């Protein structure tokens, strides 16, 4: 059968699973160590026997024999970090779990807010253009903000370059309206669809650790002339040669 990414796993103590959510993937922001679990994946399955008590799993849980063996893909050590970004890609047809739907709602919400702010910001620039045009030629100093702002065209002004310019800005505005409709539909299509992937893969989870490496004896520093060097001892402040002002080198 296929694999499982869910956190329903035996052996792992709460000490491992406290840093995972209810669907296996580590949180965004969980500062991990070298050798914790980021993505839980029950997969290496050889053979494990069942005692009367393990056979009783068929009654309440329902699973025939819990696959055949039991072991959760845990990761190795050497690096710390802070998980800053998690991507989940799903080959189309496979059931999205709850966190993949959380990322889908998140990116739908982000792209919705971003295109709506594109429309709002460019509409603000367009209305500022309308205010800049209507400074002269039939100006209304008090009557301009009594009516709602989307109708700044039918005010008193003859056939000039200004009514032509307001018609061109109405063309631009209706273009932005229908363009916003069709582009939000296309962006919902791009977020909602699956992705073509490798032969025989269900979903890909990518996790970005963000280590912060400071400095230590053993790094390589160099100037801009060929003066290389392994930094050999990180002295205290007091041992440094200072001058007759007080500042240490």
């Amino acid at each position: 059968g296929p694999e499982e990414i869910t956190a329903d796993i035996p052996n792992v103590g709460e000490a491992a699973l406290s840093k995972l959510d209810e669907s296996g993937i580590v949180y965004i922001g969980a500062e991990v160590t070298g050798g914790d679990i980021l993505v839980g994946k029950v997969t290496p399955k050889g053979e494990t026997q069942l005692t009367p008590e393990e056979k009783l799993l068929r009654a309440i849980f329902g699973e025939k024999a819990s696959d055949v063996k039991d072991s959760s893909l845990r990761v190795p050590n050497g690096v710390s970090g802070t998980v800053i970004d998690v991507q989940v890609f799903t080959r189309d047809g496979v059931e999205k779990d709850k966190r993949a739907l959380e990322i889908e709602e998140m990116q739908l919400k982000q792209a919705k807010k971003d295109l709506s702010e594109e429309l709002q910001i460019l509409e603000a620039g367009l209305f500022s253009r309308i205010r800049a045009v209507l400074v002269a030629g039939g100006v209304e100093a008090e009557k301009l903000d009594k009516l709602p702002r989307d109708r700044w065209l039918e005010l008193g002004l003859t056939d000039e370059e200004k009514q032509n310019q307001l018609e061109q800005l109405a063309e631009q505005y209706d273009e932005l309206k229908h363009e916003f409709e069709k582009k939000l539909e296309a962006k919902r299509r791009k977020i909602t669809q699956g992705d073509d992937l490798a032969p025989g893969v269900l979903k890909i989870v990518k996790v970005y650790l963000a280590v912060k490496r400071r400095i230590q004896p053993g790094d390589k520093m160099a100037g801009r002339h060929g003066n290389k060097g392994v930094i050999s001892k990180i002295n205290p402040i007091e041992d440094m040669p200072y001058d007759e002002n007080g500042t240490p080198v």
Partner: protein, 151 residues
């Protein structure tokens, strides 16, 4: 790992990091832990050094003592490019190498790397101390000139 100087050492000893020392000497630490009686099965000892508790560093300073290691520069051209030292443990991640010995390895400190090897058996510890120790290589074998000349 990358080498660095450490001029407090003698030519017979070199600095060796604690993380590399606990990885290279895992079976000696296992044997020492099983001798004391702190644990029982081998698994328990591997969990102890996987967690790195407070008691395995005294175990480590017990096995490092009087056990030479073979330091080796990567382009070894003559026999003075493999020399045996005694480890002195280093807070750090860089092999501290006594400076005079550098003129034997053709090792500057501009980003050089060296390999450490552990003589496992008892005849190999005695060969590292009695033939390949850095105090024993003070003359170059190509001639009569001293190779521990101050650089």
């Amino acid at each position: 790992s990358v080498i660095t100087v450490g001029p407090y050492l003698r030519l017979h000893q070199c600095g060796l990091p604690k993380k590399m020392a606990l990885e290279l000497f895992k079976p000696f630490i296992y044997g020492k832990l099983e001798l004391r009686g702190l644990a029982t099965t081998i698994k328990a000892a591997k969990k102890m050094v996987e967690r790195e508790e407070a008691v395995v560093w005294d175990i480590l300073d017990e096995v490092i003592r009087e056990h030479p290691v073979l330091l080796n520069r990567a382009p070894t051209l003559h026999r003075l490019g493999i020399q045996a030292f005694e480890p002195v443990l280093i807070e750090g991640k860089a092999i501290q190498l006594h400076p005079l010995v550098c003129a034997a390895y053709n090792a500057d400190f501009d980003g050089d790397q060296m390999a450490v090897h552990v003589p496992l058996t008892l005849e190999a510890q005695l060969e590292a101390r009695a033939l390949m120790m850095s105090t024993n290589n003070i003359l170059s074998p190509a001639n009569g000139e001293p190779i521990i000349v101050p650089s």
